[PDB]
Amino acid sequence: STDISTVASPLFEGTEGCFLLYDASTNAEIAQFNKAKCATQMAPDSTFKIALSLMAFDAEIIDQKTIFKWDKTPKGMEIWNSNHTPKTWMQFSVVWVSQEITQKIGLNKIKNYLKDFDYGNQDFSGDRNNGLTEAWLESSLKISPEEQIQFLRKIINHNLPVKNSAIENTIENMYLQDLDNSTKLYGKTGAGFTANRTLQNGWFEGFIISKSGHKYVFVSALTGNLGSNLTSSIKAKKNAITILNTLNL
């Protein structure tokens, strides 16, 4: 386990940040920054779409071809104001799609999947009575970076009781770009403000796959006072990419 504080500290300055990079298959910790913050559960926010995507594909309520029909009313981010696909749901963090999906899957099945996924505190209660559509959004559901790492491992290792295609479709939909050395970056951002505080939580997590197909999981996460502009995930992602490019995996 390489302590990457020298590289990661400056990137997370002004926040309580952390970074974990694990070998997917072996669970070898490859790089870590701030294990204390890594153990701290916080709301997954949009990174919950990783889990939801698995559920939605597994429950067969979506296919890659599914078009989520926008209700034609403003959703809060312009990119959300359009029809979406499971891919763009992920890419653009289209929460209304998530909310359609959770309503379709239903709380019972979500709870079952949370068990299957060993997903953090598995608390989907939300709140009123809004768990089904809000529980992952700076609400009841919490998961730590370390737990996210293990969840991610389970996904890419196909160590989840879901359809293989659910896993692969979800991973595919998380594809973002190649890193500098052509390592594949799959990831998902999440951001939110801490309940009752001005603090922001940010995540960027996912998978990297080397040119030779070697799989790693990583989580970049932070909580910090970043002001009124919700940029925590932007920072988490930029930091993850900086770190990942430095690690040259």
Ligand SMILES: *C(=O)[C@@H]([C@@H]1N=C(C(=O)O)[C@H](S[C@@H]2CN[C@H](CNS(N)(=O)=O)C2)[C@@H]1C)[C@@H](C)O
């Ligand atoms: C998920 O965590 C939430 C949504 N997911 C986001 C993402 O890109 O992953 C975003 S964070 C994005 C970055 N800066 C934007 C600021 N909001 S603004 N002023 O442009 O309206 C937001 C978003 C929070 C969740 C709501 O699904």
